[PDB]
Design a protein around this nucleic acid. Structure first.
Ligand SMILES: [Zn+2]
Length: 463
RNA sequence: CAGGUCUCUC
RNA sequence: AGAGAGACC
């Protein structure tokens, strides 16, 4: 992706979008009980921790575009992924506006506890003023999509979250490109049934792990991904996507049966306008982060990328022997013979993608089940039942999370969630985590799950 | 102060 | 149906 132009809001006739300025994070009661390095990301031009210009750092993620139209490798990739999707028989029909707003069994309702985006945000109209879970009326909604249309700008906010020390100094805070309620509705009407299919089928037919539960999905993964594993990291995947990958997505959608009017919505994803504070700007390429289907489309595009990288980099690849799952930019894949990701990464740069080793070292060392990570978690066979696989969140990540809070009223739930993650690293680490928690007054007041109970409940998931 | 998935609590 | 937390693009 690449910023094509920047204009003042006076010039564009767009109203201003000023997000919050101060972090809601504070040191928790456990801040000094565990070691950690992360702090709240920079949210403001004049944060004293900054060491470069803040806004230059913010938009530096748009590294530019390379290919704009598919080559033979990307077209064979899109078609191969498309035919694979056909076995799911996705309903390419339009979803009812009622179901698109209020949800089905496999589609969650529009989040009514959150902003309605441009222009409703600036005019003080909240989602709850238009939609209502009880009446399920779409009448007010239909009026406002006719009042305001589609293809409305994304509102930009800086994301309030923990970041490493190095990303705070270099102003590398993340951004939220918030969609307008009208566009989430129309995207949900167009692709709602595809979202349903994807949510219900995490695995290697969708090629997507959206909807997976790591507690149970991890045991399936070595079976779904036989043979030699490959994986790597992307730098700023979403923002690095050139328009070729949105063209490629258009071919996948067409081949699985989508009408031309449905497929036309992709150009409105590839070419988007955004308002940050007092300025409008155009972005060509790049997936918007706050869009309906961001996770699924990023995941679908990743299935195209991996396939096209394979057949362009190496001779004699049979794409039918590829197995992979993606959760947006995160990928774990398998092929019957090892795949050299140093060569994949070189082909990647030509497609405008920056790919680095999985182990965060400089060398593309071997990925196997003892060091693979997915959604930040490792794979650890159970000592008693070696076919059941524990997802292992590193204790370093759990330490980082526990040291801070946005609302100390929910300390207990926060700690409980971290204990549901931590015990997979084994009894020794878990009791050492619990003891460290119990070492401060609030820690002695929390209902902490007992290790044996966590293990019992997990075993019972498999019966 | 966005789009989602997952899990937990009366 | 109401409330939270974890991880994600
Ligand atoms: Zn434009």
């Amino acid at each position: 992706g690449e910023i094509q132009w920047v204009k003042p809001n006076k010039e564009t006739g767009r109203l201003n979008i000023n997000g919050p300025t101060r972090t809601k994070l504070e040191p928790s009661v456990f801040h000094d009980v565990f070691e950690g390095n992360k702090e709240p990301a920079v949210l403001h031009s004049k944060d004293p921790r900054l060491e470069v210009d803040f806004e230059q750092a913010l938009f530096s993620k748009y590294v530019g575009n390379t290919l704009y139209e598919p080559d033979e490798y990307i077209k064979e990739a899109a078609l191969h992924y498309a035919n694979q999707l056909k076995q799911l028989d996705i309903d390419t029909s339009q979803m009812s506006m009622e179901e698109a707003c209020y949800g089905t069994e496999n589609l969650e309702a529009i989040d009514l506890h959150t902003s309605a985006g441009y222009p409703y945000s600036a005019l003080g109209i909240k989602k709850r003023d238009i939609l209502d879970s009880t009446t399920r009326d779409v009448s007010k909604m239909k009026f406002y999509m006719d009042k305001y249309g589609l293809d409305l700008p994304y509102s930009t906010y800086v994301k309030d979250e923990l970041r490493s020390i190095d990303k705070i100094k270099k102003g590398k805070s993340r951004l939220i490109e918030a969609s307008s309620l009208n566009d989430s509705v129309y995207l949900r009407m167009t692709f709602g049934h595809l979202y349903e299919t994807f949510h219900a089928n995490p695995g290697t037919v969708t090629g997507s792990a959206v909807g997976c539960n790591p507690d149970t999905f991890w045991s399936k993964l070595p079976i779904l991904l036989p043979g030699s594993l490959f994986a790597f990291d992307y730098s700023g995947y979403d923002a690095s996507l050139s328009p070729v990958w949105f063209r490629a997505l258009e071919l996948v959608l067409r081949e699985i049966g989508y009408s031309e009017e449905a497929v036309s919505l992709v150009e409105g994803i590839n070419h988007t306008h955004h308002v940050y504070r007092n300025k409008t700007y155009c972005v060509l390429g790049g997936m918007p982060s706050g869009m309906s289907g961001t996770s699924i489309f990023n995941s679908m595009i990743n299935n195209i990328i991996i396939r096209a990288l394979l057949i362009k980099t190496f001779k004699g690849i049979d794409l039918d022997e590829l197995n992979m799952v993606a959760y947006g930019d995160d990928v774990l894949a398998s092929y019957p013979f090892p795949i050299d990701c140093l060569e994949l990464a070189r082909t990647g740069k030509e497609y405008g993608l920056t790919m680095t080793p999985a182990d965060k070292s400089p060398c593309f060392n071997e990925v196997n089940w003892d060091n693979a990570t997915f959604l930040k978690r490792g794979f650890l066979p159970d000592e008693q039942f070696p076919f059941l696989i524990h997802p292992t969140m590193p204790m370093k990540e759990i330490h980082e999370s526990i040291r801070w809070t946005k609302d100390a009223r929910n300390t207990q739930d926060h700690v409980r969630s971290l204990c549901l993650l931590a015990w997979h690293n084994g009894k020794q680490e878990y009791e050492k985590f619990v003891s460290a928690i119990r070492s401060v007054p609030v820690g002695k007041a929390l209902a902490i799950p007992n290790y044996e109970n966590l293990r019992r409940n997990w075993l019972e998931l498999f019966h």
